[PDB]
Design an enzyme around this catalytic site. Sequence first.
Site, PDB file in Angstrom:
ATOM      1  N   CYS B  14       0.806  -1.215   0.000  1.00  0.00           N
ATOM      2  CA  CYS B  14       0.000   0.000   0.000  1.00  0.00           C
ATOM      3  C   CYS B  14       0.850   1.281   0.000  1.00  0.00           C
ATOM      4  CB  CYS B  14      -1.065   0.006   1.110  1.00  0.00           C
ATOM      5  SG  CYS B  14      -0.466  -0.378   2.752  1.00  0.00           S
ATOM      6  N   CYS B 161      27.683  34.156  12.887  1.00  0.00           N
ATOM      7  CA  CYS B 161      28.474  34.198  14.118  1.00  0.00           C
ATOM      8  C   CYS B 161      28.060  35.390  14.980  1.00  0.00           C
ATOM      9  CB  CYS B 161      29.961  34.321  13.794  1.00  0.00           C
ATOM     10  SG  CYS B 161      31.053  34.360  15.268  1.00  0.00           S
ATOM     11  N   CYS B 208      33.465  29.059  13.736  1.00  0.00           N
ATOM     12  CA  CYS B 208      33.465  30.185  12.805  1.00  0.00           C
ATOM     13  C   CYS B 208      34.843  30.279  12.157  1.00  0.00           C
ATOM     14  CB  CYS B 208      33.160  31.484  13.562  1.00  0.00           C
ATOM     15  SG  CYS B 208      33.397  33.019  12.634  1.00  0.00           S
ATOM     16  N   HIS B 286      -1.111   1.407   7.748  1.00  0.00           N
ATOM     17  CA  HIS B 286      -1.574   1.260   6.376  1.00  0.00           C
ATOM     18  C   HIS B 286      -1.642   2.594   5.633  1.00  0.00           C
ATOM     19  CE1 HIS B 286      -3.004  -2.409   8.595  1.00  0.00           C
ATOM     20  NE2 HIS B 286      -2.291  -2.940   7.619  1.00  0.00           N
TER      21      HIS B 286
HETATM   22 ZN   LIG Z   1      33.050  34.787  14.125  1.00  0.00          ZN
END
Ligand SMILES: [Zn+2]
Lengths: 81, 328
Positions: B14, B161, B208, B286
């Site tokens: 199904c 950042c 970063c 189902h």
């Molecule tokens: Zn930064």
Amino acid sequence: GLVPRGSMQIFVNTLSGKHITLEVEPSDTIENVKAKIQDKEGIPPDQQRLIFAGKQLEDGRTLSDYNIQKESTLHLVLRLR
Amino acid sequence: AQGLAGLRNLGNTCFMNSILQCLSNTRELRDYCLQRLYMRDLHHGSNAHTALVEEFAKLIQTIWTSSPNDVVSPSEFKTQIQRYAPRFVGYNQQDAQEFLRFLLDGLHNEVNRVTLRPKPENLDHLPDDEKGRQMWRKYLEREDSRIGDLFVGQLKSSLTCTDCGYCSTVFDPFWDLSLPIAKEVTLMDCMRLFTKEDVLDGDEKPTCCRCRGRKRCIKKFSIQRFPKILVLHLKRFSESTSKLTTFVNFPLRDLDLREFASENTNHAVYNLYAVSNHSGTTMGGHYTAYCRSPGTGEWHTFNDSSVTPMSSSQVRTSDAYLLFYELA
Ligand SMILES: [Zn+2]
Ligand SMILES: [Cl-]
Ligand SMILES: [Cl-]
């Protein structure tokens, strides 16, 4: 000191929609990645599915195989059966 | 009445029938099959192990040349999908969205206009939108097909950042969106949660590049390119694993996603045309489908062999799992 963090970071959009940050290498396998998600989310690797650019990532491939670059988001989903 | 053929359950299939009917009623995809336009996009013939497009298209053709109450067998198609994706071998219940992703991947690969995929770069000199467009062109140098024309969009992810203020941007292609269940809860709440500023701190601090240290960052999605066909997959998975059965209120027309756009736009309004439903528990449940006929605009329930009329008022339920939207 400590083992180094991965050279590359990627994100995972988890089940609630919150993101987690993974420390990785281009050569990490999808299995490696699922283990990392297991570490952060508590979800067994055999229940995890990861979608990126429409592809479900497959065990046996690496991130580089799928051209997954820094700060990409993998989408975590499970299964209804 | 056209295209109202049932599909025989072959043993826990199904999931397959539900998705097939959703694709059957995907207007441009259906027509691609009926007009045999895939024939010009296939670069060579198939054998018994590689006839996925061929057997898919024949099934769609059969459905759309049937008389009402006809029951069609998708056994030959199932043989092809399981040969392409061995997880579908045998007769266990499968997840409809997993099946969707593998099926479209195989269809796409077989009709990809790119025959030799070419083998990155610093785009920081570019404005956001121009970089987005360059990344889109690069993606299309590898992935470019009529199936992609329908389903493919582009997400913009912005990572800021909180220390130096550098916002780093990446553009990921998508063929669908898997949305978190937010917060009655509406589809718009789920898309707002998907796109919300996400504060990444503690064990989630990214590194970063500018500060060269772990920093609290803010990550936010917007939609850079909206697809013609928007497939929305609702993450019905709770932590405490089990199924999240929350009623998500989704509109049948006028899903307006302009707020989530990267730039001011007007071509981000969708109408619903199909729903894949999952009823029951995480295991042993189902699948059915509710689909709007592209020709008449009337809805039908497709439950394996049985195709029956329904009111549009009965389409929205808590079992909705995949939502198929088309640009208005
Ligand atoms: Zn930064
Ligand atoms: Cl896998
Ligand atoms: Cl809504």
